[PDB]
Design an enzyme around this catalytic site. Structure first.
Site, mmCIF file in Angstrom:
data_model
loop_
_atom_site.group_PDB
_atom_site.id
_atom_site.type_symbol
_atom_site.label_atom_id
_atom_site.label_comp_id
_atom_site.label_asym_id
_atom_site.label_seq_id
_atom_site.Cartn_x
_atom_site.Cartn_y
_atom_site.Cartn_z
ATOM 1 N N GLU A 11 17.259 10.909 2.317
ATOM 2 C CA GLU A 11 16.923 11.482 1.008
ATOM 3 C C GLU A 11 15.683 12.355 1.031
ATOM 4 O O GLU A 11 15.410 13.088 0.063
ATOM 5 C CB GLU A 11 16.725 10.369 -0.053
ATOM 6 C CG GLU A 11 17.909 9.513 -0.233
ATOM 7 C CD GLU A 11 18.849 9.989 -1.270
ATOM 8 O OE1 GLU A 11 18.770 11.144 -1.691
ATOM 9 O OE2 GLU A 11 19.678 9.171 -1.703
ATOM 10 N N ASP A 20 20.421 17.552 -7.045
ATOM 11 C CA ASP A 20 20.935 17.097 -5.780
ATOM 12 C C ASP A 20 22.358 17.629 -5.551
ATOM 13 O O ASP A 20 22.902 18.369 -6.370
ATOM 14 C CB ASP A 20 20.800 15.569 -5.680
ATOM 15 C CG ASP A 20 21.745 14.820 -6.603
ATOM 16 O OD1 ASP A 20 22.865 15.320 -6.849
ATOM 17 O OD2 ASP A 20 21.387 13.702 -7.054
ATOM 18 N N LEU A 32 17.315 9.421 -8.944
ATOM 19 C CA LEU A 32 18.070 10.077 -10.010
ATOM 20 C C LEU A 32 17.402 9.862 -11.383
ATOM 21 O O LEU A 32 17.174 8.744 -11.808
ATOM 22 C CB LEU A 32 19.516 9.536 -10.041
ATOM 23 C CG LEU A 32 20.497 10.144 -11.074
ATOM 24 C CD1 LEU A 32 20.664 11.602 -10.843
ATOM 25 C CD2 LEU A 32 21.890 9.416 -11.056
ATOM 26 N N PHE A 104 22.562 3.161 -3.048
ATOM 27 C CA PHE A 104 21.382 3.929 -3.461
ATOM 28 C C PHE A 104 21.794 5.372 -3.836
ATOM 29 O O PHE A 104 21.347 5.912 -4.866
ATOM 30 C CB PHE A 104 20.379 3.927 -2.310
ATOM 31 C CG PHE A 104 19.034 4.538 -2.628
ATOM 32 C CD1 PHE A 104 18.854 5.906 -2.604
ATOM 33 C CD2 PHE A 104 17.940 3.734 -2.856
ATOM 34 C CE1 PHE A 104 17.624 6.447 -2.860
ATOM 35 C CE2 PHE A 104 16.679 4.271 -3.104
ATOM 36 C CZ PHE A 104 16.528 5.645 -3.118
ATOM 37 N N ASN A 132 38.093 7.351 5.966
ATOM 38 C CA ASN A 132 38.390 7.428 4.529
ATOM 39 C C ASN A 132 37.161 7.736 3.690
ATOM 40 O O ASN A 132 37.264 8.340 2.622
ATOM 41 C CB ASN A 132 39.150 6.187 4.016
ATOM 42 C CG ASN A 132 40.637 6.188 4.422
ATOM 43 O OD1 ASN A 132 41.461 6.919 3.854
ATOM 44 N ND2 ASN A 132 40.983 5.358 5.404
#
Ligand code: CA
Ligand code: CL
Length: 162
Positions: A11, A20, A32, A104, A132
């Protein structure tokens, strides 16, 4: 190597509000602020999170406090989710870091919706899960923030971060 160093690398660190890879408003180490399209709503959220008029800018100590709060929320979020918790508890030490990192970034609700991935992880089908997960919106939208996490789920080692 631990969850905190791992998220720091994934991050990074920004001391002014940005959008973002999902297009949402954010500061510090992937904190966020809001999913609202309104910068000003995010701006209030920030002063509210910190306890002062900021203004769109924060210190390092403050980012790290936020960071610690956000790691803590991600772990609590996993343990209180009836879908995530049993899948989490089956995971080995290193994969649990990948799981915390995934929450997170994506939030509990997003992660819990990947029903089949959760089953592949629980059955220890590391190769399929990683394939996946590499298809997900998360990966295509946030490829550099996600890549090392996905590779970590496949191998169960820290080599992606070394
Ligand atoms: Ca744990
Ligand atoms: Cl990205």
């Amino acid at each position: 190597m631990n969850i905190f160093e791992m998220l720091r690398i994934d991050e990074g660190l920004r001391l002014k509000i940005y959008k973002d890879c999902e297009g949402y408003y954010t500061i510090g180490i992937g904190h966020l602020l809001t999913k609202s399209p309104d910068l000003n709503a995010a701006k209030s959220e920030l002063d509210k999170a910190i306890g002062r008029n900021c203004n769109g800018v924060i210190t390092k100590d403050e980012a790290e406090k936020l960071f610690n709060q956000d790691v803590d929320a991600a772990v609590r979020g996993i343990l209180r989710n009836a879908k995530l918790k049993p899948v989490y508890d089956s995971l080995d030490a290193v994969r649990r870091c990948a799981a915390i990192n995934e929450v997170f970034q994506m939030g509990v609700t997003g992660v819990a919706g990947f029903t089949n991935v959760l089953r592949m992880l629980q059955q220890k089908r590391w190769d399929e899960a990683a394939v996946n997960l590499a298809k997900s919106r998360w990966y295509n939208q946030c490829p550099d923030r996600a890549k090392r996490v996905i590779t970590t789920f496949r191998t169960g080692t820290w080599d992606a971060y070394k």
